[PDB]
C-alpha cells in the first residue's frame, strides 16, 4: 500500500483523513442522497464499502435491525470473494482468523459394518493454480465488521442508519432530480412508528429474500419450491470423529450430514438434511445417529436454525421494463442485488459469495455515472451481466442433481463455480469478442483477472500482479511487453505509453478529469519479460513513473518483471502471453477482464472507452 | 489462532476478555507492584507486552514522555524480530505496512566519470532459507502502537503511566517483600514536581542510553568513543536516482550516504556520514553532491536528527555484584535492558532489534519466578546470556571495520547477525552441550528455533512449525518421530507421551499447576514423517489431542506431518532429523532451543527441568 503522498501522516495508514466533501453522519436520515442502499447484509455492506471511497457521492445505507449482527447464518468464503477482500485490503485479516478448507473428506456406510460410517474419499478443496487465496470459513458478522470498519475509516466516515424499515420506493419519471422517493419507518422503541422520507437519485435494494424494494418495483422471484430443508447448528462439542476439523460430506443409513469446521479450531457447524416443530435436540440426536460409532457430546450451541429455500430469480434486476435494454430504453433508477433478486439452493454452495459479486459489479458503475464519467446507459449492464450469470449458475446446479468421468467433470466444474471464478460474461458493451485472445491466453476475456506472481522493478518485491486492482473504482491496463519493446520504443508498449500521454485523442487524456492524478481513472501497470535488473527505470516514460499528489511524489509501482528466480513462475509462460507481440489486458474496476488487445491497436482502445465514457 | 474455547465470543478474538485478577488502571501509579518497567521504548514495550499476558502479575510501566510517540528514530526490523512479532500475533500487519528490503545495491564513483556515481553491485538482502520473514522497514512508533494495543487488549488491560521520570531506585536487602523502592517525579504541568513512590519486587530499567536505573545500581557503559556521526533525515523528495526504493549504500568523492526506503512507497530515509551547528539544508546539500548527477528535490522533511554513539556495554545487566553468579550469590532484583546496558554503532546495523531480544529473554523468566514455577536463580541467566552475546556482537563489529574471500565471509556473517539469527548461547543452566546434536542437525542447541513448513494433520493446513511458539510464556517440546514410532508404541514418540502423562516423575506432571490445562506449561507438538493422511488421530495418546478449557474442548493442533506434496519441503530433510532415531527438541518460551534429546532419554528430560522448576 502507498501513503504519505502529501506529507507524513501518523497512525494506521488505513484510516483515511476525513473528507470535507462529506457531511458528518446525522441521527436523522438525510433528506436527499445520491445513493440509498437498503439492507446491511453482505451485499449492502459490500456496496456501501465501495461507495465509501468516493466522498463526493452522498451515500446512505439503512437497515431495519437495530445494530450490527454478532453471529450470522452464512460462513463460507469463496476464493474469488477472498480476492475481492484483498481489493478492500482486509483479506489478510480474514486469512488469520478464518478456518481454511484444504481438503474435503467423504464418508459413507461401511459395507461390512452395519449402520456405521467409514471414510470413502478425499479431495483437495481448491485445485492447484485456481486462486492465490484459499476457500475459508468465517462468521458472516466478522465480514460485516471489516466492511463496517472500511466504511467508517473511509474519507466518507460512512456508517449505517439502523432501525429503519423501508416501507415503499417510488420513481417519478417526471422529476428533474432525485426521482426516487423512499418511505421509511423507524423501528426503535424511541422512534417507533415514525415515518421518514428520502429523495434519492438511485436506490439499491440489498434487502434479502423478502425484499420490499423488489416488490416495490414489481419484480418477482421466479423459480421452484424448496428442494430440501436443512437443520443448521453451530456447536461446541467433543467428538472422536477424526475428520471433524475438515469439511466433510457424510451419507448414512440414518441420514446425511455436512460438516463445516469453524474459525477458532473448536466451533463446528453441522448441516443436517431434513424434509418449525423441530428442535436442537432432534438435530443433535440425528447427527449422533449419523456419526455412529463416533460419539458427539454437545456442550454448547451458540446458534442453530433451519435453512430451507428454493432457487428463484428475477427476470431483471432493475426498474426498467425492457427484457433486453437498447439505446432507447428508459434508464434504470432502482436496482436489486443479492438474495432480493436471486436465491440459490444450499447444495449450490454459493452462500453469500455470489451475492456480494452483484454489488461489486454495480458499485463502480454507479460512481462513474454519478461523477458523469460514464453514460448512464452503463447501468444497464448491471442487470444484463448479473442476471444472466446467475441464471446460468442455476441452470447448471439444476442438473448437478445427478458417465463416471462425466461426473468427475461435473464435480470439477462445480468447484470452479463454488470458488466464484467461473463467471464468464458474454460479449457486450463492456466485454470484447476475444478475437485476439491468443495474445494472452491465460486472461480469458469476460472472466476475472487471474493473478500471478511478478517482481516489482523499483525494489525487487515479489507481488501478485492482480493485487494492483483495488476497490477504488479504477480501470486497469496491464501492458505485457513484447520481447523487444524495451529495446525498440518505435512500437510496442513504450509506443502505447507515448500515445496514452501525448495524443489528445487517447482515452487517458480524454477522460481523466483536469487536475487529477494521471492514473486516477486508468491504472496502467507495465510488465516486461526481462529480468527486473534489466529494466532501467530512469529510461522509461513518465507515464510509468507518474508523479502524483500535492508534492508530485513519484509512484514507483507501475513497472514489473517476471519471477525469473523460481522455476516455472514466469507470468508470460503461466498466462500464455504472446512473447513476440505482447498484449494489452484491459480490466474493469471489479477485476473483470474487458479486453485483450494488441498493444498497437490504439484506435480500438480509444473507441472502446469512447463508447461509454464522457469527456 | 484458537478461540471460542469456553463459548462463542463475538468481535475480534484478539481482544481478550478482561481478567478479574487484574485491577483497573488508575491515574496514580499503584503503591505496590510485582514488576516496574521504566521506559516505553522498544525494550520496555516488548517486556510489558509479554507480561500483559499474565493478569495474575501486577505490572506497571512508566515513561517520562507525556504520551505515545508518532515518529521515532529507529526503523529497521530484522528477520528474527519479525519472528518475535509473529509470536505476538502482529507480524502480519507489519508485513502489509512496512517497506520490504529485498536487495541492497552499492554505488561508488564512476571510474571514467568525474565526480559521478554508478551502480557497482547488488546483493540479495536475506540469504535463501535464513528466515520465513523478510527484513523490513517501519516507523518505530508503529511497532509501539502494536505493542500498546497488545497490552491494552490483553486480559491485563495494561496501559502506561506517562509523564513520570524515575528519579531513583533502591534495594532493601532486608525487606520481606517488595524490596525495591522507586522514586518518581511527575512531569506533566498539572502535576509538575509531584513525587511518587512505588514498592516493587523487580524493576526493569529499559530507560535508554542515559538510563537512571543503570546509574542507580552503579552499573556503567564501558566502551569506546563515538566512532562516527550521522545526519539522519526522513524526507519526501523527488529524485531520478533509480535505486531510491532499494536499501542503498553509496560511497562517493563527496561523501558517503545510506539509503533506507520507508513504509508507504514515498518516504525515504537518508543517513549522511559526518565527523550541533549543523542543519537540514547542509545534509540535503551533501546528499545532493553525493547523488550527483542524480537530482534530489526535497519537498518536505517530517523528521531529521544526528545519530552519534559509541559502542559501550555494562559488565553485568543486574544489581548482583558477582561477575559470574553461582548458587550462593545474592539474587538479582533490578535488571537493565536495551541501550541502558549496551549500545551498538550505527554500522553494526542492530537498530532496536537486539534491544528487544533482551526483554524477550527476561520476560518469561520473571513471570515463571513470580509464579513460583521456577527458582529465582533462573533470573541470573538473563545477564549471563544477554551480556555475553552482546559483547561478542561488539567484538565482531569491532573487526568488521575492515582475504577477498575472507571479506565475503565477514559480509555473510554480518548478514546473519543483523538479521538477529546469529545469537548462540553457550552451555549453561538452560542450554545443553549438544552431544546429541546429530539427532536434529538443523536445530542448533542454543540458537533460535529455525522454523520450517509442516502440514497439520487435523485439517491438512500448511503451517510454519515454529509459529506454534507464541509469546505466552510456554516451553515447547517438538517431538520429531522416528520412522517406526507410529507403528511401534513400545518406544519412541508415543512412549515419551505415555511417560509425560502417566509417570508422576515426568516434568509435565511435576510442574503443571493442579487444575490447569495439560499443555499450560509444556506445549508439546508431535511431528511424524508419515504423510498426514497416514496419521490416524483417533489412535493417538490423549496428550496429543488434549481437552482443555471449561468445556473440555479438544485441541486438534498438536499433530503434524511433513509437506510431502512439494519437492524438497520435508522438514525431516530440511532440518537434518535422524529418521531412524527421531528427536526431542526442547524450546524455551523465547523461542530458543535449550535441548536436542533422544526421545527415550526421559531421565535427562526430567532432570533438566528439575534443575530449575518448582513442583
Ligand atoms: C434462517 C436462515 C438460515 C440460513 N442459513 C444459511 C447457511 O447455513 N449457510 C449459507 O451459506 N447461507 C445461509 N442462509 C442464507 C444467507 O444468510 C444469505 O445467502 C445471505 O445473507 C445473502 O446476503 P444478502 O446481502 O443478499 O442479504 P441478507 O443477508 O439476506 O440481508 C438482507 C438485509 O436487509 C435487511 N432488510 C430487509 N428488508 C428490509 C427493509 N424493508 N428495510 C430495511 N432493511 C431491510 C435485513 O434486516 C438484512 O440485514 C440462511 C438464511 C436464513 C434466512
Ligand atoms: C537522536 C537519536 C537518533 C537515533 N537515530 C537512529 C537511527 O537513525 N537508526 C537506528 O537504528 N537507531 C537510531 N537511534 C537509536 C534507537 O533510537 C535506539 O537504539 C532504540 O530506541 C533503543 O531501544 P530501547 O528500548 O533500548 O530504548 P529507547 O528507545 O532509547 O527508549 C528509552 C525510553 O525510556 C524513557 N526514559 C528514559 N529515562 C527515563 C526515566 N528516568 N524515567 C522515565 N522514563 C525514562 C525515554 O523517554 C524513552 O522512551 C537514535 C537514537 C537517538 C537518541
Ligand atoms: Xe448443504
Ligand atoms: Xe486508457
Ligand atoms: Xe465500440
Ligand atoms: Xe549507518
Ligand atoms: Xe515436559
Ligand atoms: Xe541438570
Q: Where residue A542 sits, what CATH number does that domain have?
A: 3.40.30.20
Size of interface A-B (CB pairs under 8 A): 167
CA dihedral angle for residue B205, residue B211, residue B212, residue B214, rounded to 10 degrees:
60
Tell me, using a 6 A CB cutoff, whether residue A500 lines ligand 4: yes
Q: Tell whether A505 and A555 lie within a shared domain.
A: yes
**Nearest C-alpha in B relative to A1:** B264
Q: B410 touching A, CB under 8 A? A: no
CA of A312 to the centre of ligand 1 (A): 15
| C-alpha span between A443 and A594 (Å, rounded) | 10
The answer to whether the peptide bond before residue A293 is cis (omega within 30 degrees of 0) is yes
φ, ψ of residue A237 to 5 degrees: the values are -130, 160
Query: Whose atoms come closest to the Cα of A608: which ligand?
Result: 5
DSSP count for chain B of H helices, then E strands? 13, 28
Q: How far apart are the first and last CA of chain B?
A: 30
3-state secondary structure A66-125: CCCCCCCCCCEECHHHHHHHHHCCCHHHHHHHCEECCEEEEEEECCCCCCCEEEEEEEEC
φ, ψ of residue B69 to 5 degrees: the values are -80, 155
Chain breaks in chain B (C to N over 2.5 A) after: 275, 402
Q: Tell whether B396 and B424 lie within a shared domain.
A: no
Q: Which candidate in A459, A540, A546, A557 is best for mutational testing of the B interface (most B CBs within 10 A)?
A: A459
Residue A16 is assigned to a structural domain of this protein: no
3-state secondary structure of B116: coil
User: CA-CA distances (angstroms) from residue A607 to A327, A507, B204?
Assistant: 17, 8, 70
**Nearest C-alpha in B relative to A535:** B242
Are A102 and B264 inside 8 Å of each other by CB? no
Closest CA to A19 of A157, A163, A118: A157
Burial class (CB in 10 A: 0-12, 13-18, 19+), A553: buried
Kindly list the residues from chain A whose CB atom is less than 8 angstroms away from the CB atom of residue B538: 240, 242
- Name the DSSP class of A415: H
Residue B2 is assigned to a structural domain of this protein: no
Q: Is A62 annotated as a binding residue?
A: yes
Residue B21 is assigned to a structural domain of this protein: no
Tell me, using a 6 A CB cutoff, whether residue B353 lines ligand 2: no
Q: Tell whether B519 and B604 lie within a shared domain.
A: yes
Q: Tell whether A239 and A196 lie within a shared domain.
A: no
Nearest by CB to A460, which of B1, B5, B102? B102
Please say which residue of B378, B402, B426 terminates a domain: B402
Q: Tell whether A275 and A415 lie within a shared domain.
A: no
| C-alpha span between B234 and B305 (Å, rounded) | 9
Q: Tell whether B136 and B279 lie within a shared domain.
A: no
Residue B284 is assigned to a structural domain of this protein: yes
Question: A195-205 and A32-38: which strand pairing?
Answer: parallel
| C-alpha span between B571 and A246 (Å, rounded) | 23
| C-alpha span between B66 and A52 (Å, rounded) | 35
Closest CA to B68 of B163, B189, B167: B163
Task: Give the residue whose CA is nearest to atom 1 of ligand 8.
Answer: B608
Cell triple for B100: 520490504
- Name the DSSP class of B212: H
A213, A207 contact by CB (below 8 A): yes
Kindly list the residues from chain A whose CB atom is less than 8 angstroms away from the CB atom of residue B244: 458, 556
Domain with B609, as residue range(s), is 403-615
B325, B317 contact by CB (below 8 A): no
Q: Which residues numbered 531-570 in B keep a CB inside 8 Å of some CB on A?
A: 533, 536-538, 547, 551-557
Q: Where residue A78 sits, what CATH number does that domain have?
A: 3.50.50.60
Q: A192 touching B, CB under 8 A? A: no
| C-alpha span between A203 and A366 (Å, rounded) | 10
| C-alpha span between B588 and B442 (Å, rounded) | 17
Cβ neighbours for B409, distance < 8 A, ≥ 6 positions apart = none
- Name the DSSP class of A424: B
Q: Is B44 annotated as a binding residue?
A: yes
**Nearest C-alpha in A relative to B122:** A533
- Name the DSSP class of A241: -
B103, B127 contact by CB (below 8 A): no
3-state secondary structure B304-360: EEEECCCCEECCCCECCCCCCCCCCCCCCCEEECHHHCEECCHHHCCCCHHHHHHHH
Burial A255-268 (b: 16+ CB within 10 A, else e): ebbbbbbbbbbbbb
| C-alpha span between B5 and A264 (Å, rounded) | 8
How many Cα atoms are found within 13 Å in the side-chain-facing hemisphere of B539?
Answer: 8
B135, B101 contact by CB (below 8 A): yes
Residue A193 is assigned to a structural domain of this protein: yes
Closest CA to B358 of B44, B133, B39: B44
Burial class (CB in 10 A: 0-12, 13-18, 19+), A193: exposed
Cβ neighbours for A57, distance < 8 A, ≥ 6 positions apart = A34, A35, A51, A366, A367, A370, A371
Burial class (CB in 10 A: 0-12, 13-18, 19+), B31: exposed
Cell triple for B229: 556521526
Q: Which candidate in A70, A95, A245 is best for mutational testing of the B interface (most B CBs within 10 A)?
A: A245
Q: Residue B17's Cα: distance from chain center in Å?
A: 25
Tell me, using a 6 A CB cutoff, whether residue A321 lines ligand 5: no
| C-alpha span between B326 and B332 (Å, rounded) | 12
Kindly list the residues from chain B whose CB atom is less than 8 angstroms away from the CB atom of residue A91: none
Q: B122 touching A, CB under 8 A? A: yes
Look at the alpha carbons of B505, B507, B508, B514 in this order and tell me if their dihedral is positive or negative.
positive
Q: Tell whether A282 and A337 lie within a shared domain.
A: no
Cell triple for A385: 451481466
Please, which residues bridge with residue B448 across strands? Answer: B592
Residue recorded with cell 535492558: B337
Tell me, using a 6 A CB cutoff, whether residue B524 lines ligand 7: no
Question: H-type helices in A195-279, by residue range?
Answer: 212-216
CA of A285 to the centre of ligand 2 (A): 63
| C-alpha span between A185 and A192 (Å, rounded) | 8
A284, A218 contact by CB (below 8 A): no
Cβ neighbours for B387, distance < 8 A, ≥ 6 positions apart = B313, B314, B315, B316, B317, B341, B342
Look at the alpha carbons of B42, B44, B45, B47 in this order and tell me if their dihedral is positive or negative.
positive
Please say which residue of B266, B290, B309 terminates a domain: B309
A251, A109 contact by CB (below 8 A): yes
A71, A63 contact by CB (below 8 A): no
User: CA-CA distances (angstroms) from residue A334 to A216, A317, B260?
Assistant: 10, 8, 52
**Overall size of chain A counted in residues:** 615
| C-alpha span between A7 and A27 (Å, rounded) | 34
Q: Angle CA(A331)–CA(A335)–CA(A338) in degrees, nearest 5?
A: 155
B156, B17 contact by CB (below 8 A): no
| C-alpha span between A447 and A443 (Å, rounded) | 8
Q: Which residues numbered 210-249 in B keep a CB inside 8 Å of some CB on A?
A: 234, 236, 238, 240, 242, 244-246
| C-alpha span between A524 and B146 (Å, rounded) | 34
Q: Tell whether B471 and B533 lie within a shared domain.
A: yes
| C-alpha span between A477 and A522 (Å, rounded) | 7
The answer to whether the peptide bond before residue B293 is cis (omega within 30 degrees of 0) is yes
Residue B202 is assigned to a structural domain of this protein: yes
Are B13 and A70 inside 8 Å of each other by CB? no
Q: Tell whether B305 and B398 lie within a shared domain.
A: no
DSSP count for chain A of H helices, then E strands? 13, 28
Nearest by CB to A461, which of B89, B102, B145? B102
Counting from 1 in the atom list of ligand 2, the atom nearest the Cα of B344 is: 19
Q: Output the DSSP codes for A526-551.
A: EE-SS-GGG--GGGS-GGGS-EETTT
Q: Tell whether B346 and B477 lie within a shared domain.
A: no
Are B238 and A547 inside 8 Å of each other by CB? yes
Q: Residue A612's Cα: distance from chain center in Å?
A: 23
Resolution of this deposited model, Å: 2.5
Are B245 and A536 inside 8 Å of each other by CB? no
Question: H-type helices in B426-543, by residue range?
Answer: 493-502, 507-511
Are B551 and A103 inside 8 Å of each other by CB? no
| C-alpha span between B339 and B355 (Å, rounded) | 7
| C-alpha span between B57 and B47 (Å, rounded) | 13
Closest CA to A591 of A383, A368, A423, A376: A423
Q: Tell whether A153 and A247 lie within a shared domain.
A: no
Burial B67-105 (b: 16+ CB within 10 A, else e): ebbbebbbbbbbbbbbbbbbbbbbbebbbebbbbbbbbb
A206, A362 contact by CB (below 8 A): no
Cell triple for A67: 445494530
Strand intervals (E) in B350-498: 453-456, 462-464, 475-480
Are B100 and A459 inside 8 Å of each other by CB? yes
Question: H-type helices in B540-583, by residue range?
Answer: 571-574
Residue A23 is assigned to a structural domain of this protein: no
Q: Residue B310's Cα: distance from chain center in Å?
A: 23
| C-alpha span between A224 and A427 (Å, rounded) | 29
Q: Is A7 annotated as a binding residue?
A: no
Q: Is A103 annotated as a binding residue?
A: no
Residue A19 is assigned to a structural domain of this protein: no
Tell me, using a 6 A CB cutoff, whether residue B522 lines ligand 7: yes
Q: How many domains does chain A have?
A: 3
Nearest by CB to B537, which of A242, A461, A552? A242
Q: Tell whether B484 and B528 lie within a shared domain.
A: yes
Q: Where residue A121 sits, what CATH number does that domain have?
A: 3.30.9.10
φ, ψ of residue B508 to 5 degrees: the values are -60, -40
Element (H, E) at A467: none
A377, A353 contact by CB (below 8 A): no
Please say which residue of A402, A434, A468 terminates a domain: A402
Amino acid at each position: 500500500m502507498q501513503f504519505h503522498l502529501n506529507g507524513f501522516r501518523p497512525g494506521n495508514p488505513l484510516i483515511a483523513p476525513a473528507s470535507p466533501l462529506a457531511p458528518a453522519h446525522t441521527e436523522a436520515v438525510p433528506s436527499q442522497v445520491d445513493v440509498l442502499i437498503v439492507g446491511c447484509g453482505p451485499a449492502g455492506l459490500t456496496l456501501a464499502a465501495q461507495l465509501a471511497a468516493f466522498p463526493d457521492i452522498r451515500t446512505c445505507i439503512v437497515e431495519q435491525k437495530e445494530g450490527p449482527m454478532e453471529l450470522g447464518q452464512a460462513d463460507g468464503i469463496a476464493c474469488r470473494t477472498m480476492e475481492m477482500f484483498e481489493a478492500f485490503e482486509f483479506a489478510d485479516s480474514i486469512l488469520k482468523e478464518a478456518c481454511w478448507i484444504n481438503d474435503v473428506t467423504f464418508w459413507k456406510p461401511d459395507p461390512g459394518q452395519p449402520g456405521r460410517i467409514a471414510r470413502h474419499g478425499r479431495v483437495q478443496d481448491t485445485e492447484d493454480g485456481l486462486s492465490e487465496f484459499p476457500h475459508v470459513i468465517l462468521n458472516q458478522a466478522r465480514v460485516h465488521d471489516h466492511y463496517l470498519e472500511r466504511m467508517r475509516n473511509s474519507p466518507s466516515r460512512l456508517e449505517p442508519h439502523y432501525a429503519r424499515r423501508v416501507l415503499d420506493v417510488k420513481v417519478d419519471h417526471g422529476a428533474a432530480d432525485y426521482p426516487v422517493t423512499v418511505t421509511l419507518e423507524r423501528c426503535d422503541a424511541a422512534h417507533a412508528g415514525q415515518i421518514e422520507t428520502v429523495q434519492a437519485r438511485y436506490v439499491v435494494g440489498c434487502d434479502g429474500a423478502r425484499s420490499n424494494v423488489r416488490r416495490a418495483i414489481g419484480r418477482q422471484l421466479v423459480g421452484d419450491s424448496a428442494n430440501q430443508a436443512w437443520g443448521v447448528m453451530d456447536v461446541l462439542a467433543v467428538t472422536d470423529f477424526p475428520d471433524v476439523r475438515y469439511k466433510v460430506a457424510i451419507q448414512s443409513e440414518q441420514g446425511n450430514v455436512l460438516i463445516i469446521p469453524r474459525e477458532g479450531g473448536h466451533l463446528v457447524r453441522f448441516y443436517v438434511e431434513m424434509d418449525r416443530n423441530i428442535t436442537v435436540e432432534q438435530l443433535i440426536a440425528t447427527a449422533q445417529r449419523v456419526l455412529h460409532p463416533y460419539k458427539l457430546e454437545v456442550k454448547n450451541v451458540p446458534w442453530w436454525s433451519v435453512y430451507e429455500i428454493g432457487q428463484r430469480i428475477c427476470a431483471k434486476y432493475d426498474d426498467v421494463v425492457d427484457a433486453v435494454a437498447t439505446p432507447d430504453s428508459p434508464l434504470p433508477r432502482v436496482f436489486i442485488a443479492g438474495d432480493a433478486c436471486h436465491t440459490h439452493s444450499p447444495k449450490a454452495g454459493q452462500g453469500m459469495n455470489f451475492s456480494m459479486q452483484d454489488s461489486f459489479n454495480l458499485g463502480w458503475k454507479l460512481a462513474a455515472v454519478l461523477r458523469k464519467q460514464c453514460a448512464p446507459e452503463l447501468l444497464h449492464t448491471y442487470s444484463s451481466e448479473r442476471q444472466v450469470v446467475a441464471q446460468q449458475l442455476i441452470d447448471f446446479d439444476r442438473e448437478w442433481a445427478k458417465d463416471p468421468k462425466e461426473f468427475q467433470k461435473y464435480f470439477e466444474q462445480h468447484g470452479r463455480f463454488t470458488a466464484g471464478v467461473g463467471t464468464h460474461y458474454a460479449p457486450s458493451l463492456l466485454t470484447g469478442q476475444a478475437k485476439h485472445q491468443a495474445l494472452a491466453s491465460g486472461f480469458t476475456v469476460g472472466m476475472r483477472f487471474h493473478s500471478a506472481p511478478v517482481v516489482r522493478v523499483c525494489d525487487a518485491k515479489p507481488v501478485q500482479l492482480g493485487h494492483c486492482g483495488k476497490a477504488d473504482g479504477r480501470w486497469r491496463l496491464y501492458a505485457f511487453a513484447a520481447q523487444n519493446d524495451l529495446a525498440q520504443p518505435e512500437s510496442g508498449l513504450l509506443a502505447l505509453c507515448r500515445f496514452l500521454e501525448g495524443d489528445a485523442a487517447s482515452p487517458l487524456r480524454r477522460f481523466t478529469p483536469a487536475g487529477q492524478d494521471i492514473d486516477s481513472i486508468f491504472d496502467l501497470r507495465a510488465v516486461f519479460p526481462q529480468a527486473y535488473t534489466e529494466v532501467a527505470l530512469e529510461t522509461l516514460p513518465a507515464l510509468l513513473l507518474p508523479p502524483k499528489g500535492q508534492l508530485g511524489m513519484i509512484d514507483y509501482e507501475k513497472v514489473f518483471s517476471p519471477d525469473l528466480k523460481n522455476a516455472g513462475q514466469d507470468i508470460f509462460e503461466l498466462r500464455g502471453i504472446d512473447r513476440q507481440q505482447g498484449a494489452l489486458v484491459v480490466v474493469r474496476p471489479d477485476q473483470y477482464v474487458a479486453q485483450v488487445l494488441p498493444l498497437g491497436d490504439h484506435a480500438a482502445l480509444s473507441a472502446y472507452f469512447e463508447s461509454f465514457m464522457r469527456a
